[PDB]
Symmetry: C3
Subunit: 267 residues, 3 copies
Amino acid sequence: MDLSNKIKAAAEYIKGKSKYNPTIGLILGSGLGAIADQIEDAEYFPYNEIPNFPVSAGRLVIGKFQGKEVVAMQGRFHYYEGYSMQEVTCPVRVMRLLGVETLVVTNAAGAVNKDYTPGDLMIISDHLNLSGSNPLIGKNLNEFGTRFPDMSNAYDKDLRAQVKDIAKNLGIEVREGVYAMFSGPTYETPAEVRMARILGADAVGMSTVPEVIIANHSGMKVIGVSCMTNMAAGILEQPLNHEEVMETSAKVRKTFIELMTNIIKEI
Amino acid sequence: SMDLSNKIKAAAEYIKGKSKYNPTIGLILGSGLGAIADQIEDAEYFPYNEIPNFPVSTAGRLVIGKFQGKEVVAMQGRFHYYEGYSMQEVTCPVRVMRLLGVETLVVTNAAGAVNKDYTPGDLMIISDHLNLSGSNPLIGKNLNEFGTRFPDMSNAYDKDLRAQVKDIAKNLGIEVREGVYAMFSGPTYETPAEVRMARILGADAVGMSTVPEVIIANHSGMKVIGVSCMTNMAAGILEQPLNHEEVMETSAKVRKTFIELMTNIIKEI
Amino acid sequence: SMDLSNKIKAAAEYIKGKSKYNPTIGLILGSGLGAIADQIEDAEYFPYNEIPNFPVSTGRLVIGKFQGKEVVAMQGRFHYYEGYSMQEVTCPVRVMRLLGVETLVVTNAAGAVNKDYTPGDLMIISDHLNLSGSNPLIGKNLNEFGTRFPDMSNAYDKDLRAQVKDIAKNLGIEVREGVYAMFSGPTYETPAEVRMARILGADAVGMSTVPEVIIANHSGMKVIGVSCMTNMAAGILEQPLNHEEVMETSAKVRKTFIELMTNIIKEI
Ligand SMILES: O=c1[nH]cnc2c([C@@H]3N[C@H](CO)[C@@H](O)[C@H]3O)c[nH]c12
Ligand SMILES: O=c1[nH]cnc2c([C@@H]3N[C@H](CO)[C@@H](O)[C@H]3O)c[nH]c12
Ligand SMILES: O=c1[nH]cnc2c([C@@H]3N[C@H](CO)[C@@H](O)[C@H]3O)c[nH]c12
């Protein structure tokens, strides 16, 4: 089965066991899994039961949310754990076949812009791929998109205006800047963070960019919000630590959920 | 590797056994630029799917014959790293052309103009390059019959030959630019942020090719001239999506001037 | 079917059962500096092609006494440009940790991007940039060595770096300090890529060191990096780069380099 058939086999499996035509995809990262656990009349598809899914826990949650039919990944597949870029982004392809037209991606990142504070929410206006790989390398899947997809509106400008307008109505302070993905799993060095600032990055992370590339190629609109869980490694004298990342993510979590619940109602 | 070396020589011996020519000039043409191969005289034709160990495509051909007093072999169609080939698969035809006798390589490509003073249709003499792809064609065991383990890259695009191209274009009235070409892996078009980073790194043009061939060319002992056609302004400069149909149309509108430059270059080389 | 975790265990098991030593300092020498390992006394030799699961060549481990310390030296390292994976390149560091190594001393030869330097200078590495395109920690995390997301704010120990500078001052050895950028290789950089490297904040460009430093820090080891500027980085001068001259410049200051290395190992 070519990668093309393997994607379709996973989609026909879910479609044959689903009452839903989900229109919004959710890749929740910054501890926003609580959003998935509030989906109504949910169907659950764990990854190990879906054919051709990446192996080794997480699950797909499909159901109702603020009048929208959604599908959400609980756990994410990461490039630093050893998965290929094709395995990392396969759930996005299956999402397209389930009917997804708008993808909402959230993550946790380190603030490179010295004007940010941990806890801030940065709408992703653009990204820099600094990992050394590309998920579209290989034979093009013509049933999904063109060989040379455009990336001038990777994070839909009109959707970004909607988030800003929604955040203003709710009184939620929001930032907007360029996200940069490193492969990981090492935290960046102080010199690499200064390099990221020079290249134009406002935040650094280890995800998001692969699925945003595939979602655009598959004909989806993409909206991305990154939660600054820490200052990037070079800016403060304290060492970076993942227990600190989850903690800061948990502090501003409720505001993040409120912002993300309102956009899905209004998309 | 020995397997690669065997398969490279097996491809060249196949071509040599069926060819009348001993070419010294090589050409690598990137799609909307392959029409100059149609002007090679009494040409021989070798489709890639008939040459042993040539990478299978997802139908490009070698064109060998006379051109402006020289004997040339032109790659009508090149293999790209974004299609899934390894770096060694992408560049192994350059090794084949070397065993064919090629001493000077003319690399052409289509690229997006990062320099805001450039215009779609301009021709850029590649003076240097930035490898931003995340791979190197020489990683692995060295092919000792072709070059050294640590090849120098200080004159990758021959300075004397760039000066000869600048004088030929001046003699013909052809405006030519000269700048640095950056290669991304592809097949995505760069984001506006990646284009601004490309300018910060010192790049005047962005493309998805050239760099791997130039590395293997210089490693093999060949001189290289790079002429990149500005088929579009790089992403984010204008308020337009980037489209492969635009790349093809601009390549087609500048073909006449591009043929006249290269035709004279090959004669005076 | 033996996982990476047990392959490293078997390598350490093989060396341990054949060694009376528990070295605390690891030496990845490469700026020539093979004489350092020659001066290891009462030494035990472990050829690479005899340690189980070590990467295949086309080198040896030296363990013994040095300046009051018990050390294990890597005589000849594995490079990413030769085709080894990032895990094959750094596997000896995992083995060195199981042998009890607490501090890693990495030397190399690099091209000087900073125009202040002159060929022959010695630069303490204060930080690095990974421009190779890979990372030796990508894959399943080895829980017995370190954490999933290791911090890299002190990749080259600051207190140790100051001790080198004190030792270099009492010895009268000139010393620079700057950032090391690792390209993949094996090509020498282009003049544009060198200009890019400086814009990125790099003072030297090389083809190694970065993978070992990442794995050493992940395993809980302190790292000292010393780079010898064997040449001006490409484009800085109007002459080509080649390996014969890198080795000539490494040879011209081996004595001075070796005074520094013998003294720091003594005072660590
Ligand atoms: O400063 C950072 N650099 C890189 N990644 C992260 C993250 C994200 N959280 C996780 C590791 O803290 C991981 O998913 C990573 O993408 C938070 N802060 C940073
Ligand atoms: O702006 C650009 N960015 C990247 N590649 C290209 C190209 C080249 N042409 C093809 C894409 O249209 C592809 O082979 C690439 O190398 C033209 N313009 C651009
Ligand atoms: O200017 C340079 N660029 C990249 N590597 C090196 C080296 C080192 N010596 C070897 C290549 O000459 C290799 O180990 C590389 O790490 C010396 N100078 C340079």
